[PDB]
Amino acid sequence: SVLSGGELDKWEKIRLRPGGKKQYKLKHIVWASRELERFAVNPGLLETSEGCRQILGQLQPSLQTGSEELRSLYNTIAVLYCVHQRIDVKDTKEALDKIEEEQNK
Ligand SMILES: COc1ccc(C(=O)Nc2ccc(Oc3ccc(N(C(=O)[C@H]4CC[C@H](C)CC4)C(C)C)c(C(=O)O)c3)cc2)cc1
């Protein structure tokens, strides 16, 4: 399974945008999984912090010139990586900053 019982609950509290109304749902995970297949990426990688980090490494070079679809996929996986990593986040913006802040020492 992509998310554990505890994970889904954290998942459901995270906002798509800072202070936004919309929050993450199972359908974003289902969409991200189909999307990965469309990008020739193994959707099983969604299941772990390490697999999600590998996917973001694969997608990031294309993120600067990316379409909304690619940017949305990337944002959803970053959030999932945080959830798998047990990094608390309130929204997608926070998730992206915390990942940026781990790497960037
Ligand atoms: C101020 O900082 C920020 C500003 C903006 C954002 C932000 O936009 N975050 C942000 C935007 C999109 C994100 O992920 C998705 C992926 C698929 C979606 N779906 C779609 O149908 C979309 C598929 C792609 C297509 C191109 C549009 C429809 C369905 C699964 C519901 C949706 C959605 O519409 O809820 C959202 C995650 C974060 C985050 C931070």
Side-chain angles (χ1 to χ4, degrees), residues 1-104:
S1 195
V2 170
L3 284 195
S4 287
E7 280 181 329
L8 180 57
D9 208 85
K10 291 211 183 141
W11 182 253
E12 296 181 323
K13 329 180 154 172
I14 299 162
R15 311 191 172 273
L16 265 47
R17 296 158 276 269
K21 301 310 189 176
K22 295 191 192 161
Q23 281 155 314
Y24 286 98
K25 297 167 182 188
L26 292 167
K27 69 171 181 186
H28 289 107
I29 294 178
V30 175
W31 180 82
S33 191
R34 291 166 177 173
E35 278 294 287
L36 286 174
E37 285 177 274
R38 149 187 156 77
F39 282 91
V41 174
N42 168 21
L45 287 173
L46 288 178
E47 292 161 21
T48 67
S49 308
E50 160 168 5
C52 285
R53 185 200 327 284
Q54 284 177 329
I55 289 163
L56 297 179
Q58 208 55 208
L59 304 174
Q60 195 173 52
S62 306
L63 188 63
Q64 175 71 27
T65 55
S67 55
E68 279 309 311
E69 173 187 3
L70 174 55
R71 283 186 219 274
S72 306
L73 178 58
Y74 191 95
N75 282 356
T76 298
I77 295 174
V79 177
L80 193 59
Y81 165 81
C82 284
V83 169
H84 287 321
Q85 270 300 298
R86 293 185 139 179
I87 296 169
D88 308 305
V89 294
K90 312 333 151 308
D91 56 55
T92 305
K93 194 189 180 178
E94 260 186 24
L96 285 162
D97 297 339
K98 296 214 182 168
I99 289 155
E100 174 220 298
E101 298 157 0
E102 297 202 301
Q103 156 187 64
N104 277 284

PDB file of all heavy atoms in Angstrom, residues 65-80:
ATOM      1  N   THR A  65      11.094  23.997 -16.411  1.00  0.00           N
ATOM      2  CA  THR A  65      10.277  24.257 -17.633  1.00  0.00           C
ATOM      3  C   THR A  65       8.963  23.414 -17.617  1.00  0.00           C
ATOM      4  O   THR A  65       8.278  23.280 -18.645  1.00  0.00           O
ATOM      5  CB  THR A  65      11.052  23.826 -18.929  1.00  0.00           C
ATOM      6  OG1 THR A  65      11.439  22.464 -18.799  1.00  0.00           O
ATOM      7  CG2 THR A  65      12.298  24.646 -19.130  1.00  0.00           C
ATOM      8  N   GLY A  66       8.633  22.847 -16.445  1.00  0.00           N
ATOM      9  CA  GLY A  66       7.508  21.900 -16.394  1.00  0.00           C
ATOM     10  C   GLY A  66       6.092  22.435 -16.597  1.00  0.00           C
ATOM     11  O   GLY A  66       5.822  23.574 -16.206  1.00  0.00           O
ATOM     12  N   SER A  67       5.221  21.626 -17.210  1.00  0.00           N
ATOM     13  CA  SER A  67       3.818  21.994 -17.389  1.00  0.00           C
ATOM     14  C   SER A  67       3.151  21.903 -15.988  1.00  0.00           C
ATOM     15  O   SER A  67       3.748  21.377 -15.034  1.00  0.00           O
ATOM     16  CB  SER A  67       3.097  20.999 -18.314  1.00  0.00           C
ATOM     17  OG  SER A  67       3.271  19.665 -17.780  1.00  0.00           O
ATOM     18  N   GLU A  68       1.918  22.404 -15.870  1.00  0.00           N
ATOM     19  CA  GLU A  68       1.191  22.300 -14.593  1.00  0.00           C
ATOM     20  C   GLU A  68       1.080  20.846 -14.145  1.00  0.00           C
ATOM     21  O   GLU A  68       1.163  20.521 -12.954  1.00  0.00           O
ATOM     22  CB  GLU A  68      -0.242  22.825 -14.770  1.00  0.00           C
ATOM     23  CG  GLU A  68      -0.246  24.308 -14.702  1.00  0.00           C
ATOM     24  CD  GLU A  68       0.507  24.691 -13.451  1.00  0.00           C
ATOM     25  OE1 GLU A  68       0.160  24.082 -12.358  1.00  0.00           O
ATOM     26  OE2 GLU A  68       1.445  25.534 -13.571  1.00  0.00           O
ATOM     27  N   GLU A  69       0.832  19.958 -15.096  1.00  0.00           N
ATOM     28  CA  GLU A  69       0.733  18.514 -14.779  1.00  0.00           C
ATOM     29  C   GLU A  69       2.021  18.003 -14.074  1.00  0.00           C
ATOM     30  O   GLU A  69       1.956  17.298 -13.061  1.00  0.00           O
ATOM     31  CB  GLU A  69       0.529  17.688 -16.049  1.00  0.00           C
ATOM     32  CG  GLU A  69       0.599  16.148 -15.806  1.00  0.00           C
ATOM     33  CD  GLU A  69       0.559  15.307 -17.095  1.00  0.00           C
ATOM     34  OE1 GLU A  69       0.540  15.873 -18.211  1.00  0.00           O
ATOM     35  OE2 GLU A  69       0.569  14.061 -17.004  1.00  0.00           O
ATOM     36  N   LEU A  70       3.186  18.334 -14.650  1.00  0.00           N
ATOM     37  CA  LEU A  70       4.458  17.889 -14.067  1.00  0.00           C
ATOM     38  C   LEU A  70       4.678  18.568 -12.711  1.00  0.00           C
ATOM     39  O   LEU A  70       5.140  17.939 -11.758  1.00  0.00           O
ATOM     40  CB  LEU A  70       5.642  18.282 -14.983  1.00  0.00           C
ATOM     41  CG  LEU A  70       7.040  17.979 -14.346  1.00  0.00           C
ATOM     42  CD1 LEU A  70       7.042  16.530 -13.964  1.00  0.00           C
ATOM     43  CD2 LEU A  70       8.189  18.186 -15.363  1.00  0.00           C
ATOM     44  N   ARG A  71       4.412  19.872 -12.647  1.00  0.00           N
ATOM     45  CA  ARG A  71       4.556  20.593 -11.362  1.00  0.00           C
ATOM     46  C   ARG A  71       3.609  19.991 -10.333  1.00  0.00           C
ATOM     47  O   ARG A  71       3.987  19.798  -9.191  1.00  0.00           O
ATOM     48  CB  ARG A  71       4.214  22.058 -11.526  1.00  0.00           C
ATOM     49  CG  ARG A  71       5.378  22.772 -12.195  1.00  0.00           C
ATOM     50  CD  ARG A  71       5.142  24.300 -12.265  1.00  0.00           C
ATOM     51  NE  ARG A  71       5.622  24.862 -13.535  1.00  0.00           N
ATOM     52  CZ  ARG A  71       6.873  25.259 -13.752  1.00  0.00           C
ATOM     53  NH1 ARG A  71       7.771  25.159 -12.749  1.00  0.00           N
ATOM     54  NH2 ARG A  71       7.226  25.729 -14.980  1.00  0.00           N
ATOM     55  N   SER A  72       2.379  19.700 -10.728  1.00  0.00           N
ATOM     56  CA  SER A  72       1.454  19.101  -9.729  1.00  0.00           C
ATOM     57  C   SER A  72       1.920  17.716  -9.219  1.00  0.00           C
ATOM     58  O   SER A  72       1.739  17.376  -8.037  1.00  0.00           O
ATOM     59  CB  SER A  72       0.029  18.997 -10.312  1.00  0.00           C
ATOM     60  OG  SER A  72      -0.400  20.297 -10.806  1.00  0.00           O
ATOM     61  N   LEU A  73       2.433  16.892 -10.137  1.00  0.00           N
ATOM     62  CA  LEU A  73       2.938  15.571  -9.773  1.00  0.00           C
ATOM     63  C   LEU A  73       4.095  15.720  -8.762  1.00  0.00           C
ATOM     64  O   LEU A  73       4.229  14.957  -7.806  1.00  0.00           O
ATOM     65  CB  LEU A  73       3.486  14.882 -11.042  1.00  0.00           C
ATOM     66  CG  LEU A  73       4.133  13.467 -10.857  1.00  0.00           C
ATOM     67  CD1 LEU A  73       3.019  12.518 -10.209  1.00  0.00           C
ATOM     68  CD2 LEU A  73       4.555  12.911 -12.248  1.00  0.00           C
ATOM     69  N   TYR A  74       5.010  16.627  -9.103  1.00  0.00           N
ATOM     70  CA  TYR A  74       6.167  16.833  -8.273  1.00  0.00           C
ATOM     71  C   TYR A  74       5.743  17.277  -6.837  1.00  0.00           C
ATOM     72  O   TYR A  74       6.215  16.730  -5.889  1.00  0.00           O
ATOM     73  CB  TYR A  74       7.056  17.919  -8.878  1.00  0.00           C
ATOM     74  CG  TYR A  74       8.387  17.974  -8.188  1.00  0.00           C
ATOM     75  CD1 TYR A  74       9.480  17.277  -8.725  1.00  0.00           C
ATOM     76  CD2 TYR A  74       8.573  18.735  -7.024  1.00  0.00           C
ATOM     77  CE1 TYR A  74      10.753  17.341  -8.146  1.00  0.00           C
ATOM     78  CE2 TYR A  74       9.843  18.832  -6.409  1.00  0.00           C
ATOM     79  CZ  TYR A  74      10.945  18.124  -7.010  1.00  0.00           C
ATOM     80  OH  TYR A  74      12.235  18.226  -6.531  1.00  0.00           O
ATOM     81  N   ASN A  75       4.850  18.249  -6.754  1.00  0.00           N
ATOM     82  CA  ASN A  75       4.335  18.799  -5.477  1.00  0.00           C
ATOM     83  C   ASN A  75       3.717  17.637  -4.616  1.00  0.00           C
ATOM     84  O   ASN A  75       4.032  17.477  -3.424  1.00  0.00           O
ATOM     85  CB  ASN A  75       3.253  19.827  -5.819  1.00  0.00           C
ATOM     86  CG  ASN A  75       3.811  21.196  -6.287  1.00  0.00           C
ATOM     87  OD1 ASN A  75       4.972  21.401  -6.294  1.00  0.00           O
ATOM     88  ND2 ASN A  75       2.924  22.087  -6.711  1.00  0.00           N
ATOM     89  N   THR A  76       2.910  16.793  -5.266  1.00  0.00           N
ATOM     90  CA  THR A  76       2.222  15.688  -4.545  1.00  0.00           C
ATOM     91  C   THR A  76       3.244  14.707  -3.996  1.00  0.00           C
ATOM     92  O   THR A  76       3.184  14.322  -2.847  1.00  0.00           O
ATOM     93  CB  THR A  76       1.228  14.945  -5.489  1.00  0.00           C
ATOM     94  OG1 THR A  76       0.209  15.864  -5.943  1.00  0.00           O
ATOM     95  CG2 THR A  76       0.503  13.753  -4.798  1.00  0.00           C
ATOM     96  N   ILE A  77       4.269  14.379  -4.784  1.00  0.00           N
ATOM     97  CA  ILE A  77       5.290  13.422  -4.317  1.00  0.00           C
ATOM     98  C   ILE A  77       6.157  14.014  -3.243  1.00  0.00           C
ATOM     99  O   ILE A  77       6.580  13.332  -2.303  1.00  0.00           O
ATOM    100  CB  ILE A  77       6.088  12.852  -5.551  1.00  0.00           C
ATOM    101  CG1 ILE A  77       5.060  12.041  -6.400  1.00  0.00           C
ATOM    102  CG2 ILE A  77       7.222  11.907  -5.144  1.00  0.00           C
ATOM    103  CD1 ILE A  77       5.615  11.526  -7.704  1.00  0.00           C
ATOM    104  N   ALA A  78       6.433  15.295  -3.328  1.00  0.00           N
ATOM    105  CA  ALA A  78       7.285  15.907  -2.269  1.00  0.00           C
ATOM    106  C   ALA A  78       6.530  15.740  -0.886  1.00  0.00           C
ATOM    107  O   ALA A  78       7.126  15.539   0.195  1.00  0.00           O
ATOM    108  CB  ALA A  78       7.407  17.435  -2.585  1.00  0.00           C
ATOM    109  N   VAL A  79       5.224  15.979  -0.957  1.00  0.00           N
ATOM    110  CA  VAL A  79       4.394  15.910   0.267  1.00  0.00           C
ATOM    111  C   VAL A  79       4.452  14.509   0.788  1.00  0.00           C
ATOM    112  O   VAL A  79       4.624  14.285   2.006  1.00  0.00           O
ATOM    113  CB  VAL A  79       2.927  16.416  -0.011  1.00  0.00           C
ATOM    114  CG1 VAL A  79       2.050  16.247   1.329  1.00  0.00           C
ATOM    115  CG2 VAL A  79       3.002  17.948  -0.223  1.00  0.00           C
ATOM    116  N   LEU A  80       4.343  13.550  -0.121  1.00  0.00           N
ATOM    117  CA  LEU A  80       4.383  12.143   0.275  1.00  0.00           C
ATOM    118  C   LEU A  80       5.703  11.769   0.855  1.00  0.00           C
ATOM    119  O   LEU A  80       5.776  10.957   1.792  1.00  0.00           O
ATOM    120  CB  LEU A  80       4.086  11.304  -0.940  1.00  0.00           C
ATOM    121  CG  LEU A  80       3.802   9.883  -0.642  1.00  0.00           C
ATOM    122  CD1 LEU A  80       2.513   9.767   0.377  1.00  0.00           C
ATOM    123  CD2 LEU A  80       3.431   9.258  -1.985  1.00  0.00           C
TER     124      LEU A  80
END
